[PDB]
Design a protein around this ligand. Structure first.
Ligand SMILES: *[C@@H]1O[C@H](CO)[C@@H](O[C@@H]2O[C@H](CO)[C@@H](O[C@@H]3O[C@H](CO[C@H]4O[C@H](CO)[C@@H](O)[C@H](O)[C@@H]4O)[C@@H](O)[C@H](O[C@H]4O[C@H](CO)[C@@H](O)[C@H](O)[C@@H]4O)[C@@H]3O)[C@H](O)[C@H]2NC(C)=O)[C@H](O)[C@H]1NC(C)=O
Ligand SMILES: *[C@@H]1O[C@H](CO)[C@@H](O[C@@H]2O[C@H](CO)[C@@H](O[C@@H]3O[C@H](CO[C@H]4O[C@H](CO)[C@@H](O)[C@H](O)[C@@H]4O)[C@@H](O)[C@H](O[C@H]4O[C@H](CO)[C@@H](O)[C@H](O)[C@@H]4O)[C@@H]3O)[C@H](O)[C@H]2NC(C)=O)[C@H](O)[C@H]1NC(C)=O
Ligand SMILES: *[C@@H]1O[C@H](CO)[C@@H](O[C@@H]2O[C@H](CO)[C@@H](O[C@@H]3O[C@H](CO[C@H]4O[C@H](CO)[C@@H](O)[C@H](O)[C@@H]4O)[C@@H](O)[C@H](O[C@H]4O[C@H](CO)[C@@H](O)[C@H](O)[C@@H]4O)[C@@H]3O)[C@H](O)[C@H]2NC(C)=O)[C@H](O)[C@H]1NC(C)=O
Ligand SMILES: *[C@@H]1O[C@H](CO)[C@@H](O[C@@H]2O[C@H](CO)[C@@H](O[C@@H]3O[C@H](CO[C@H]4O[C@H](CO)[C@@H](O)[C@H](O)[C@@H]4O)[C@@H](O)[C@H](O[C@H]4O[C@H](CO)[C@@H](O)[C@H](O)[C@@H]4O)[C@@H]3O)[C@H](O)[C@H]2NC(C)=O)[C@H](O)[C@H]1NC(C)=O
Ligand SMILES: *[C@@H]1O[C@H](CO)[C@@H](O)[C@H](O)[C@H]1NC(C)=O
Ligand SMILES: *[C@@H]1O[C@H](CO)[C@@H](O)[C@H](O)[C@H]1NC(C)=O
Ligand SMILES: *[C@@H]1O[C@H](CO)[C@@H](O)[C@H](O)[C@H]1NC(C)=O
Ligand SMILES: *[C@@H]1O[C@H](CO)[C@@H](O)[C@H](O)[C@H]1NC(C)=O
Ligand SMILES: *[C@@H]1O[C@H](CO)[C@@H](O)[C@H](O)[C@H]1NC(C)=O
Ligand SMILES: *[C@@H]1O[C@H](CO)[C@@H](O)[C@H](O)[C@H]1NC(C)=O
Ligand SMILES: *[C@@H]1O[C@H](CO)[C@@H](O)[C@H](O)[C@H]1NC(C)=O
Ligand SMILES: *[C@@H]1O[C@H](CO)[C@@H](O)[C@H](O)[C@H]1NC(C)=O
Ligand SMILES: [Ca+2]
Ligand SMILES: [Ca+2]
Ligand SMILES: [Ca+2]
Ligand SMILES: [Ca+2]
Ligand SMILES: [Ca+2]
Ligand SMILES: [Ca+2]
Lengths: 388, 388, 388, 388
């Protein structure tokens, strides 16, 4: 086995094609399925895995009451092969209420954060054994991506944030070789508030598209030099912005270096990536809440903060159906690196009151250079009929 | 690992021997089993897999109401090892309400069709990663085999139909190398309406025996040249015809080049294959509905449209018990290529009203050059006692 | 991978040591466990598998009513790794109401018999593909071992019986190379009625200890020359006899060449093997029914029909708890071939009336040259409390 | 594959980092989970396994009544991959009410003890086959570690005790090469009462930290020379003692060679290991019962019986939540041997009366040379709401 370098061109992308769905909530109506949130997909050199943060319970289970909560001692990172729903035989790969995973071409890395809100611990688990850990630096919910980290030449990188949700915080990018934290660079450049980075290889570096929870409805960008550890940061230029909340299409504005200051507070995890000077991104369709999910190409939307010229719109989930977190992952082809995305379909509290629990299913798409049609892939669970 | 060429003679066939049954519906009476239809078997160079189109639900599950429906967003292709019933730990290999799979000797191909009836998308997934997709060409339920595709020298072929069920439609045969659509040939020769081809290697080409849903109770044949991409087409000569509906044995007639125009409208998925100038086929015993299932050898039935001389009849499922789709698959022996078949045993709506759901189990047989006896392998589920 | 020859000495045996138990019936009280009977253990060169004949249902399942019946269309051979209870994810390896399996060192053989009582079919499945089949020869429940076949130099042998349970029948020993029936020898020598042979390698041949269902409470022996296909047969000399029913210890008698004519009618599957001129065997403790299970060494009990000198008694299952079929299997050590046995613990009908079903669990022991103690390993299920 | 020598330095340890949790009891509230006690973790050269002694039942199961009992015929050793909860598809690797497992670098050894209290049998199972067994020597609950054995150069060692719980007993250390008992050394040196040793490699020997159930609240130490089979024994010097019960921190005293005679009677399984002349250990926080669980480094606590200078305290489980057995396991890194521990979280009888059963979940930590924070990882099951 060799290390993944990802030293290949990004694939031709004309839009995205259907790839997986787990129907997890519909299945949990007549089966033992884990209660989850904050899921993601990541793949070894052969095949993909779906991950999620469990609530240490199944759904048709008295313990599923109040799974609205973000951090308990019972949250673990569940890891299955993609499209195998989180059944009772699913492996919990670490204790974690925040996490991120990747494969360097030789073995898995899991970055797992649990413990006290004011003093959480990040364990680093590579090749099925604990190799390192770090404390919270700022003592206020040490957290990371909730999607795949990225490894190049065997150096894995991961964005972690400690401190305020709605003010300045302390973001650090760690570098990991065989599970060992070998360097820490701190957040630098013009990105002001960084979370939950959806990151992807982009030889010779990594690139991340994050969530500003403070002043921006534009998403931050972070560029990571793997070799000398340098960090630059900015925002997705594109005049059509990717966070939720945001202002509508006619009212919105962005900026390449600064938060737009537009409904900025709060956010949702999301993704985007560069296509020359164009940008592919997706987002919730509804501008205030996590209902619906679309993707498009903004032309010059990677280098022109004034551009609102989208093309290749696809509805992934229609505007009446619920979405949630979404993130990028990258899959090496024969000649090129393709780009894929998953989308958390959240059901339950607080939005839905028919049931006491909070879970999610996923649906997953992949970049295609072929043709494709139209549709809608929502959760499909009828909450009026689920475990009373 | 090398590519499958299948450059071996077809095995001596004196009839078929029992091979698998999953008892899926009986199991679903006290366990969590997926609701399925449109199943098939296909095998890698070591071992076989059962596939089916799930309804994104298990049976003892409120979501199993109305699984009569043919296409929802929740349908995925389930893939298990043959004889492992579709339990909750079963892997969903793509989103699909129409599908077809094969192994080229190196890796799996899945052809998966989902999305809008008028604009469905066909994703092509090879070696656990999406490589291509195509849109509907005619905008009316893009669909494919519901049984294994066939790959020779690493070029996989698959029949896909778009357009009318009960008039002319646009059938295309695609060619796929490592998940990449490398050519499309359109349907040619004298076959008028083509569906759900049960296809099998026949070095140097592929051969398919399809379903005419329009004017024929004889089944179409399609011959696919893998090397220069040419396509010829006709009908199964044999005077005893293989579709359902059909006219009875004394009243029936066929034709080698044309639909018999005999109760032709509608049909059911089925299979047949040549044995010199003889033909092996199977079919439902009842001539109007999917009750019972038999197989036989019509002598000169591959080259003489007047022949009604059958021998080696076997009842697979008796005439009081329900059948459904059936299709061929092919298994490489030490010296020869054997031929096998599965048979969908459909239970539930609309025919059976004791329950609100629609599922199936399977039973599977294989060509044998040995001797064999007699029996009946129905579904065995007592619907009077199942999830009320 | 090479072929198993088993060209090693039988291990020193001072008695048997505990090896596995599946608690299948106790588990089925709060889980989805298959209804089974006629189980056995067999092992590949690495590890062991438990097999059983399923009733195409789980226990807490309406379909478990009447699983007393010996042959239905829904019976399949279940195969798990040893000590993994027959859960819903268990693989059904063929359709079978009678079966036998072995590994030649390269791949599995399954011998599977299903279909009409008067015209049953025996499929031969090797390396995950059907290679041969035979019809019933005598048209009266073609049946085989219900325990492992034995393969030497890649020629597997299996005893099959067709015809009368309580008169002369037609026993044949088949020889199989890569799933192909390459020869059939018919039953020869002085054994009059042969069933359900518990067979074991004994270089250069195989040896079997069977069930006489007609005139003998002594068990038959069958010797199989793998190279020239010759067959001799007799009975276990030992004056303490191994069938059930039988006469008590003081009243009993045997004979090396002839059925003892002692309560002979009927029987139960069992095992024994030679240790020089001594014999190891086990049997039910109760002499008329399948309650309890013991093992011992009869000294000179392999060559002297008058000897009733037992030593090294072990209770495997105490005389108040239910037993059932038991059979031998053989496990290659570094220097020697060890001998092991499983014991069917039958629960349910007709003997137990608290429930409508009929199943079994297993317990398994292995030959040891060490020391060992005493105990009792019954089924442990409280049928007064099970699925009403 | 080569033999594990463990000829590497013990890793830098600054405390312990989170590693796994199975939430087994919370899961058993809406799923089929085994009833267990006496669990442990052990790892092959790639990955870790959780083990436990099952009660031959699942929790939501009538058979879970009275699982308070220590030895029944239905207890088997369950083995899963670490963090896969003991679901119904879990493999029972032997019959055992006392056990211990290890991997020599080539294959697993299981040491399994079942049968009569006064005449129990210890089976030794290596590479999926029984190789040896021994009887009870003293005829009073032959028992072993309930945590991993240790293998060096392919000689595995294991501590076993027979005889009195609250007086002198007969402890022996066995040596096993490929499952074969090749020598037995008896307990020697100044350790008076030995149980349930938590053992760990320490090249060139093994070292164990045990439970004195008679006169000591200090834990015994046993040193095992693998090459010449010699045995020395003593007690953990450290003035803060590791058993439960014990006297409080201000009242307590220890002794390097003798039981402290301090509330000594009874005990709980535990672990410790040397760090130069310092000692790492953990223990229950409550001094009389198995509520809470902490770990610390006593400075000079390995060579000075007067030292009560602890540093690097971590709460693993807070003082209101239940603990239980805990034990060490060892994981080979690239350059060093790390040390990890699991902790049995016991729920049910006799302490908790809301339910009739007795089970446990686990939580697992690992030595880290990094930094770490604070938290609490209890069982989390609400017994007021569980299977009535
Ligand atoms: C079958 O499926 C395919 C693929 O999904 C559909 O084709 C796509 O249709 C979408 C939506 O209409 C297209 O996305 C849109 O691109 C527009 C670009 O304008 C024109 O420019 C191109 C070339 O430059 C011309 O060839 C063409 O005439 C375009 O019209 C944007 O203006 C759109 O944005 C606006 O409309 C959307 C959606 O309605 C609004 O929500 C936005 O906020 C905004 O106002 C949009 O992005 C897409 O490019 C097409 N894809 C491809 C590959 O062709 C078929 O429409 C579909 N068929 C059926 C029957 O459903
Ligand atoms: C045990 O199991 C075996 C195998 O299943 C059975 O043997 C088969 O029996 C079937 C059904 O009778 C045979 O199939 C039939 O072939 C007929 C051919 O006619 C004769 O020609 C051959 C040689 O040319 C002669 O040797 C022989 O005498 C044949 O009679 C066809 O005429 C049949 O078609 C007609 O009958 C069927 C079924 O009854 C109708 O439904 C049809 O519509 C049609 O009118 C039929 O196809 C088969 O060939 C036999 N197989 C083998 C390998 O021999 C045994 O019968 C069975 N035994 C018991 C006791 O059940
Ligand atoms: C702990 O566990 C061990 C192993 O299970 C037990 O030791 C075994 O005990 C059994 C049962 O008593 C022994 O089996 C018996 O062998 C007898 C042979 O007679 C003597 O011959 C030898 C040497 O030739 C002498 O050393 C010895 O004194 C023997 O007594 C047979 O006569 C027995 O058959 C009769 O008794 C049985 C059982 O009671 C009846 O049911 C039979 O029908 C018959 O009348 C019997 O086969 C066995 O050999 C011992 N094994 C070993 C390895 O020593 C311990 O007894 C046990 N301890 C406790 C406390 O339970
Ligand atoms: C975030 O998480 C980290 C790691 O868990 C915490 O830091 C640890 O805090 C614990 C508990 O206070 C420390 O353990 C203690 O060590 C003491 C040593 O005394 C001093 O000596 C060192 C150097 O020699 C000085 O640097 C330092 O000032 C120490 O104070 C012992 O005295 C303690 O034992 C006593 O206190 C405990 C716990 O309160 C009692 O229960 C005992 O019975 C006993 O009386 C104790 O062992 C530990 O060393 C720290 N670890 C590290 C790596 O620094 C942070 O406290 C935490 N932050 C928050 C906000 O929760
Ligand atoms: C669910 O949790 C809430 C918050 O603790 C609690 O008040 C409520 O009683 C719980 N609901 C049920 C049905 O137990
Ligand atoms: C967005 O979601 C809100 C919240 O329910 C809803 O009321 C509103 O109609 C939605 N807005 C749009 C523009 O679809
Ligand atoms: C099942 O679905 C039908 C069609 O929508 C609906 O009318 C009916 O109420 C459903 N049945 C039940 C029991 O909910
Ligand atoms: C075919 O099926 C129909 C539909 O129920 C039934 O009424 C009829 O009797 C069957 N016909 C034959 C010839 O068996
Ligand atoms: C079980 O089967 C018997 C035999 O057919 C039948 O008479 C009886 O009604 C069945 N029992 C139940 C409870 O359905
Ligand atoms: C054997 O079993 C029968 C059947 O129940 C029982 O009545 C009898 O007591 C048993 N006999 C012996 C000798 O244990
Ligand atoms: C549980 O076991 C105890 C001890 O045998 C018994 O007395 C009691 O009846 C059992 N409880 C139930 C609910 O059956
Ligand atoms: C220890 O546990 C006992 C048993 O319930 C409890 O009563 C006591 O308060 C605990 N002691 C301490 C010091 O926490
Ligand atoms: Ca924001
Ligand atoms: Ca259930
Ligand atoms: Ca038709
Ligand atoms: Ca008999
Ligand atoms: Ca249940
Ligand atoms: Ca003590």
């Amino acid at each position: 086995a060799e290390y993944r370098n990802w030293s290949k061109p990004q694939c031709d992308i004309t839009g995205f094609a259907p790839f997986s769905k787990d129907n997890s909530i519909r299945l949990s109506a007549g089966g033992d399925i884990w209660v989850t949130r904050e899921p993601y997909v990541s793949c070894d050199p052969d095949k993909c895995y779906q991950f999620a943060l469990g609530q240490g319970t199944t759904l048709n289970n008295v313990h599923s009451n109040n799974t609205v909560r973000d951090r308990t001692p019972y949250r673990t990172l569940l890891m299955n092969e993609l499209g195998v729903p989180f059944h009772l035989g699913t492996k919990q790969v670490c204790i974690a209420w925040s996490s991120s995973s990747c494969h360097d071409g030789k073995a898995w890395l899991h970055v797992c954060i649990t413990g006290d809100d004011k003093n959480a611990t990040a364990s680093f688990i590579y090749n099925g054994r604990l190799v390192d850990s770090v404390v919270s630096w700022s003592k206020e919910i040490l957290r990371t991506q909730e999607s795949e980290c990225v490894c190049i030449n065997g150096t894995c990188t991961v964005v972690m944030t400690d401190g305020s949700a709605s003010g300045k915080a302390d973001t650090k990018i760690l570098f990991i070789e065989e599970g060992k934290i070998v360097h820490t660079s701190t957040l630098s450049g013009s990105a002001q508030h960084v979370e939950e980075c959806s990151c992807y290889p982009r030889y010779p570096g990594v690139r991340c598209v994050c969530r500003d929870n403070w002043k921006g409805s534009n998403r931050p960008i972070v560029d990571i030099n793997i070799k000398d550890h340098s960090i630059v940061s900015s925002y997705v230029c594109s005049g059509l912005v990717g966070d939720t909340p945001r202002k509508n299409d006619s009212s919105s504005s962005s900026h390449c270096l600064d938060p737009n200051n537009e409904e900025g507070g709060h956010g949702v995890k999301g993704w985007a990536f560069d296509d020359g000077n164009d940008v592919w991104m997706g987002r919730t369709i509804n501008e205030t809440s996590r209902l619906g999910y679309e993707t498009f190409k903004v032309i010059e939307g990677w280098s022109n903060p004034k551009s609102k010229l989208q093309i290749n719109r696809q509805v992934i989930v229609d505007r009446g159906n619920r979405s949630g977190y979404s993130g990028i992952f990258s899959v090496e082809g024969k000649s090129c690196i393709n780009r894929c995305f998953y989308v958390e379909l959240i059901r339950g509290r607080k939005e839905e009151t028919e049931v006491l629990w909070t879970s999610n299913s996923i649906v997953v798409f992949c970049g295609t250079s072929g043709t494709y049609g139209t549709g809608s892939w929502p959760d499909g669970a009828d909450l009026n009929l689920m475990p009373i």
